[PDB]
Amino acid sequence: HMLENKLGIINQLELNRVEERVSKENAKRLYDSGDIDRIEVGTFKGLSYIHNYLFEDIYEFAGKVRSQNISKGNFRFAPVMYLEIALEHIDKMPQRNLDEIVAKYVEMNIAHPFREGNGRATRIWLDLILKKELKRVVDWNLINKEDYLSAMERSPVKDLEIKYLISNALTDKINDREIFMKGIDISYYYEGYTEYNVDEL
Amino acid sequence: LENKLGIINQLELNRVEERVSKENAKRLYDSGDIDRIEVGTFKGLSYIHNYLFEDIYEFAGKVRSQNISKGNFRFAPVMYLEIALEHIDKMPQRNLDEIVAKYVEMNIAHPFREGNGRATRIWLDLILKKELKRVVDWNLINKEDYLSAMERSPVKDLEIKYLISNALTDKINDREIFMKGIDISYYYEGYTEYNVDEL
Ligand SMILES: Nc1ncnc2c1ncn2[C@@H]1O[C@H](COP(=O)(O)O)[C@@H](O)[C@H]1O
Ligand SMILES: Nc1ncnc2c1ncn2[C@@H]1O[C@H](COP(=O)(O)O)[C@@H](O)[C@H]1O
Ligand SMILES: [Ca+2]
Ligand SMILES: [Ca+2]
Ligand SMILES: [Ca+2]
Ligand SMILES: [Ca+2]
Ligand SMILES: [Ca+2]
Ligand SMILES: [Ca+2]
Ligand SMILES: [Cl-]
Ligand SMILES: [Cl-]
């Protein structure tokens, strides 16, 4: 049993691998065409664009505010009954420093506005806030998978674990294709996608 | 995590760990060694774990010496592991309710540093096969439904029991069912590069 998709795939392994190829392919194009730099920074509109850009081919819900309730582990993400107003309040949150950018990122993860693909899209969106505001981007290879997922699970209660991780992984190489491309490979790895290397179209 | 091959990169250790242990999982089955071992004991679980990770981890098939936590859940304390595993061995396994309860306790014990999910799911299928003449068609269980049901299982095993019951197959000697199951088991832990049968 799995997520409804456009391509009518009924095998979990099959969907995981094809989603990874169509979406990482899109992620490569997003960076290379410079479409990435024309996107609105720190807003839901910007996140929505990143999400639709990646999952347009495989998912009907790509870039849309979900109409269903979702959860991971023992945590329920922002209920549909107030998800939209909660998103309007995230758009207004300041992003003037790391403590603020991390707090805003933690709230956007709680909102979790999409049916699936929240993690990957919100990590691209965060890197552009850090790029704009601190002239820093994350080197996702410096953060261990287990450490990241554990910090995010804790983040609705105390964001110090994820703050320390982002802080110690920040790099000044803001226009480096390798830092981005590797970060995409590490981002997908966090979500359990390990078949492709983004380098290849 | 420290490995035998001295791998420092996380992505590198992930695909090497997958290659090596999945090739071992294929050989475990194809040699028929899988059916030569003890069903429902820590001895059998320990054999399965050693068989999978003996090339990569020094701790393969060995009981952990450090305490572990997943979220706000603490697994069996290292000091009580020996006692807990002896009690699990004594747990009945006559029907699905008993088999699932045994599996749930074994997951709470989590006797190894790493690879509990993968080694215990193989162990579970062998208890199901011996006692019910059923095995799990793991594709019929969503990754996140499975993971959420496992995290819930110490409080209520209704969720995981429901997933296991609705995925039971009588294809006990089906190699394709076993192989697809290993690939899904590894995918549950985030390893999606290889197909076990292509090794
Ligand atoms: N239990 C949790 N509580 C809060 N955030 C979580 C939890 N588990 C995972 N996450 C976040 O959710 C992302 C996955 O996005 P998705 O697959 O759409 O749910 C991860 O990359 C984390 O940022
Ligand atoms: N919070 C949790 N509570 C109980 N069992 C869990 C939890 N998270 C994961 N698991 C189980 O742990 C396995 C992963 O094993 P390992 O990576 O060795 O710790 C999964 O396949 C689940 O069966
Ligand atoms: Ca996901
Ligand atoms: Ca490959
Ligand atoms: Ca070997
Ligand atoms: Ca060897
Ligand atoms: Ca693991
Ligand atoms: Ca492959
Ligand atoms: Cl995701
Ligand atoms: Cl595992």
Side-chain angles (χ1 to χ4, degrees), chain A:
Chain A
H1 199 78
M2 65 225 72
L3 209 77
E4 179 160 280
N5 58 84
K6 288 193 156 175
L7 321 179
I9 289 142
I10 67 101
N11 195 316
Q12 284 185 83
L13 275 161
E14 188 73 282
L15 181 58
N16 179 281
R17 290 191 181 156
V18 304
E19 181 197 321
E20 169 173 21
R21 181 179 180 274
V22 320
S23 73
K24 286 200 165 174
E25 190 175 348
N26 287 355
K28 218 210 191 197
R29 182 178 45 96
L30 176 72
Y31 194 83
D32 287 347
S33 64
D35 281 346
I36 188 71
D37 313 313
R38 286 178 275 281
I39 315 171
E40 198 174 61
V41 181
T43 68
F44 173 69
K45 188 185 158 288
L47 182 64
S48 186
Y49 182 91
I50 293 155
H51 196 264
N52 183 258
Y53 209 105
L54 299 172
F55 308 111
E56 183 178 2
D57 305 295
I58 184 67
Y59 299 125
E60 200 66 270
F61 60 75
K64 294 191 274 218
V65 176
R66 66 187 154 81
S67 59
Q68 291 159 57
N69 283 303
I70 56 159
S71 57
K72 204 167 262 200
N74 196 47
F75 184 79
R76 195 209 247 196
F77 297 103
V80 172
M81 63 188 172
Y82 62 77
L83 174 54
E84 252 173 59
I85 186 76
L87 281 173
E88 290 177 44
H89 289 198
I90 295 153
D91 277 359
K92 294 180 189 172
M93 286 178 88
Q95 54 188 52
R96 299 167 288 181
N97 54 56
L98 193 58
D99 291 278
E100 286 184 352
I101 300 162
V102 165
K104 188 170 186 156
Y105 174 68
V106 163
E107 289 307 312
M108 194 45 101
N109 178 57
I110 298 172
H112 234 62
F114 317 109
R115 179 65 191 86
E116 158 69 3
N118 297 276
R120 287 162 289 166
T122 313
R123 278 185 305 276
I124 290 157
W125 176 87
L126 164 73
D127 271 338
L128 311 167
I129 300 162
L130 294 164
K131 185 169 158 177
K132 184 190 211 171
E133 302 297 342
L134 309 178
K135 307 318 293 158
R136 294 296 189 273
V137 288
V138 184
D139 190 353
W140 291 106
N141 190 49
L142 299 180
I143 307 163
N144 167 39
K145 176 181 173 170
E146 284 106 293
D147 286 351
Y148 172 76
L149 296 167
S150 184
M152 292 309 296
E153 183 280 324
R154 182 91 166 102
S155 79
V157 184
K158 251 174 234 173
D159 69 1
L160 185 48
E161 277 169 39
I162 192 59
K163 202 171 280 192
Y164 167 101
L165 293 174
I166 292 169
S167 180
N168 284 101
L170 290 170
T171 182
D172 62 349
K173 214 41 233 76
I174 260 59
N175 296 108
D176 202 35
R177 208 177 164 270
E178 293 177 350
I179 291 290
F180 181 84
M181 295 296 161
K182 187 170 200 72
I184 294 302
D185 277 2
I186 295 284
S187 169
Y188 276 73
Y189 153 75
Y190 286 170
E191 312 306 336
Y193 297 86
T194 69
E195 167 87 311
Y196 306 105
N197 270 2
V198 74
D199 273 333
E200 310 118 25
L201 295 174

Side-chain angles (χ1 to χ4, degrees), chain B residues 171-184:
Chain B
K171 283 130 187 277
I172 285 324
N173 300 120
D174 204 290
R175 185 186 185 263
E176 190 52 56
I177 289 291
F178 174 85
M179 295 297 176
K180 183 178 179 180
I182 290 291
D183 281 346
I184 291 136

Side-chain angles (χ1 to χ4, degrees), chain A residues 12 17 143 145 194 197, chain B residues 10 15 139 141 192-193 195:
Chain A
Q12 284 185 83
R17 290 191 181 156
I143 307 163
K145 176 181 173 170
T194 69
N197 270 2
Chain B
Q10 62 175 335
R15 298 217 249 193
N139 192 60
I141 310 175
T192 73
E193 172 47 87
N195 289 338

